[PDB]
């Protein structure tokens, strides 16, 4: 009656864009990147070593001054480090210890966290009295919550495992938008440098671009064979890297609507727990789970480095705003703060 | 400096407060509570008192945390590593669903919707050494059911004997036959009674026996 009415219509829809994506696909990225130099041996040393977490570390986020950083561990502590002198500024205790994400406000006044308790609490750092206190709990998601990201002091986008991403107004405390196109569990978020779009990855093996003011799903990209675990934006704001459980990273261009470069090696067939980019967009840093991070080069697709100082698997990593550092938390309760040495 | 010497003073005031909450958090028992749906999980938490419903029921000199993941309508492969370090796993199965098929896809009589689950939980890589408490929930409810129909609808390879106390030799051993890694974890088993102690005292003394076999493996002997 009507089941194959729009099913066979849907076969017209994708086939209108499947070969159209191949139509503007004139040459391989690994054939026009032969012109440039390789990056070289990226040997990086754990300068500081932030110890003090007592369980697995599930997310960390750098402040905007490239000096403070917040790390959220699975024993239910949020800890703000002075990453210069390896000392604690604040240690925020959490109402539910099942944290899967954390974020730093770009003004520094606020930190948020959420996880398996389905709420993204935000915390006021710089207040009149001495302590950090919680400002608003943003309830309204029905899945587990996997990424909080602040747009400014009053708007924060959260993705969740009820297949929905949302936009919020923290002053009022309720969703101004909801972004529903995903079919599987949404695992990642990456706000744009202009903060006008974002991309979010899901367990349907597809990632999608959104608009924060419109509310509709702007683009949709396939290419992976299992769950997407991490998305960050390129420093363009015009590209993103998806790290998946298929042991691969892949790089999409939003204006080109399809993937360009795939980062894999035959000797590694475990997942990719976190992704971040560097200041040039020349170093893709990706925290795998054969217990070490791999520093991929985004233009050549080789393993440019290894950061092998971690006991258990690398669950999070973030690179600064100016490119000066990269922390990696992991499931063995340390943050190795790396830096390249002359 | 001189203001930095009061930053460092404040930071090891933080450090001696992390390491006082983290020694009072390795002294508490964490138990993932699982189940296949209508499994009597509400019955067990009634004895011991939108995402995690973290229940604390500390009763005999021993702090207890029980994490009901009941409402998570999402992929369990994506948040089950959060419970890797955990003491036990209290798995519930109602025994009065042995001829009760599911209305999902004319599925088998809900024990193949529990042996479906138990074989996935017991052979999961985060729970290779996580010893699993088993509960058989409806004891005096399927004694009425076994008279009306035997356990041949569920498994037609059973012996017979048509008795309430036969079904342990049918059903209970059929779950512990799915325990592939038999060296590392020891499936405990019980029959969930309405008595005050014997459903919560059993979780107490069979988590002492996880604790002791954790220390003996950690202190070299076992």
């Amino acid at each position, epitope marked *: 009656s009507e089941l194959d009415q729009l099913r066979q219509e849907a076969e017209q829809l994708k086939n209108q864009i499947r070969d159209a994506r191949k139509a503007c696909a004139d040459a391989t990225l690994s054939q026009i990147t032969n012109n440039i130099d390789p990056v070289g041996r990226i040997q990086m040393r754990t300068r500081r070593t932030l110890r003090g977490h007592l369980a697995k570390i599930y997310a960390m986020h750098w402040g905007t001054d490239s*000096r*403070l950083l917040v790390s959220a561990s699975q024993d239910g502590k949020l800890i703000i480090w*002075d990453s*210069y*002198t390896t*000392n604690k*500024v*604040h240690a925020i205790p959490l109402r539910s210890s099942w944290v899967m994400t954390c974020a730093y406000a770009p003004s520094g006044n606020y930190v948020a966290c959420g996880g398996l308790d389905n709420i993204c609490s935000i915390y006021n750092l710089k207040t*009149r*009295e*001495g*302590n950090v206190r919680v400002s608003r709990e943003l309830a309204g998601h029905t899945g587990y919550l996997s990424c909080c990201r602040f747009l400014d002091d009053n708007q924060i986008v959260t993705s969740s495992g009820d297949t929905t991403c949302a936009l919020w107004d923290i002053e009022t405390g309720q969703q101004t938008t909801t972004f529903t196109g995903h079919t599987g569990d949404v695992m990642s978020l990456s706000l744009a440098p202009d903060t006008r779009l974002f991309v979010s990855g899901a367990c349907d093996a597809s990632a999608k671009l959104w608009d924060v003011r419109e509310g509709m799903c702007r683009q949709t990209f396939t290419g992976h064979e299992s769950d997407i675990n991490a998305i960050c934006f390129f420093p363009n704001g015009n590209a993103f890297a998806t790290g998946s459980d298929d042991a691969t990273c892949r790089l999409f261009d939003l204006r080109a609507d399809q993937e360009l470069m795939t980062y894999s090696h035959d000797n590694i067939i475990c997942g990719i727990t976190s992704v971040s980019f560097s200041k040039s967009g020349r170093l893709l840093l990706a925290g795998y789970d054969d217990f070490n991070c791999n520093v991929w080069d985004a233009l050549k697709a080789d393993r440019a480095g290894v950061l092998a100082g971690h006991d258990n698997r690398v669950s999070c990593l973030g690179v600064t705003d100016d490119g000066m550092a990269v922390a990696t938390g992991s499931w063995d309760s340390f943050l190795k703060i790396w830096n390249g040495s002359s | *400096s*001189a*203001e*930095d*010497k*009061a*930053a460092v*003073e*404040r*930071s090891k*005031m933080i450090d001696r407060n992390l390491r006082e909450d983290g020694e009072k958090a390795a002294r508490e028992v964490k138990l993932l509570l699982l189940g296949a749906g209508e499994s009597g999980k509400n019955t067990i938490v009634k004895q011991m008192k939108t995402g995690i419903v973290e229940t604390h029921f500390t009763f005999k000199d021993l702090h207890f945390k029980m994490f009901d993941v009941g409402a998570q309508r999402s992929e369990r492969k994506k948040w089950i590593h959060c419970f890797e370090g955990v003491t036990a796993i209290i798995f519930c199965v109602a025994l009065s669903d042995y001829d009760l098929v599911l209305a999902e896809d004319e599925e088998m009589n809900r024990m193949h919707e529990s042996m479906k689950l138990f074989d996935s939980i017991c052979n999961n890589k985060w729970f290779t050494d996580t010893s699993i408490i088993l509960f058989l929930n409806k004891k005096d409810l399927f004694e009425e059911k076994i008279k009306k129909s035997p356990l041949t609808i569920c498994y037609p390879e059973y012996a017979g004997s048509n008795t309430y106390e036969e079904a342990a030799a049918y059903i209970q051993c059929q779950f512990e036959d799915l325990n592939k890694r038999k060296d590392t974890k020891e499936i405990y088993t019980h029959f969930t009674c309405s008595t005050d102690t014997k459903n919560v005292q059993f979780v107490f003394d069979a988590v002492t026996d996880v604790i002791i076999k954790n220390n003996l493996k950690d202190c070299g002997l076992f």
Partner: single-chain antibody
Amino acid sequence: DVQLVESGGGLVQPGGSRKLSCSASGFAFSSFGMHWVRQAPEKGLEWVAYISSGSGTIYYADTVKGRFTISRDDPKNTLFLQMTSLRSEDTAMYYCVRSIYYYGSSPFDFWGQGTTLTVSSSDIVMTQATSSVPVTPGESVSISCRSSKSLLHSNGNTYLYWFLQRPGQSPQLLIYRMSNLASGVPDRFSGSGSGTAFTLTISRLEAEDVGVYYCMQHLEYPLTFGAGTKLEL
């Protein structure tokens, strides 16, 4: 919100002893380092003591070292000071000042209302050569003071602390660490300088920016104020 009201004293003979107490309310008292700062009649500010957060570090002033003792009580939220064998030089109004030190904090922001105590009958000095400026509102005024040492430390920051004591009032933090503006201050005030010479540049005066404009250092102990630059209108 914050309130630090202290008490105790009013007339104690020389050779006697008087205990001061500063009762705190409205803030997380056990996170803050406390101080005491005294102020003689018709004279300037001068530092007395210190207790760090959690009673770890205690510094004193060399005029009172051994005669004075400082004690905090974190469950009761009350700062003490016990003073022995009182001299006539110990005639001052005593202020209870809070302070917190982590990365980026503004110490010395909230000052208490003050308690007078009268009796009957090597380190850096800060120099404010100016003692009186009679002006009119609406125009820019730069207050400047000088240091013995280079206040720029090797980590990067320069510990000079500007203050303002309105007539009949308590001091308040204008510019902490020589450059940054505190909480509750208007944006008209600003501080700058390099190394040894600094300047506090108000761009447009008001009828309430008139008062004595002190400068303190915090590079090393003791903490030393100079005599203030009095403004008139």
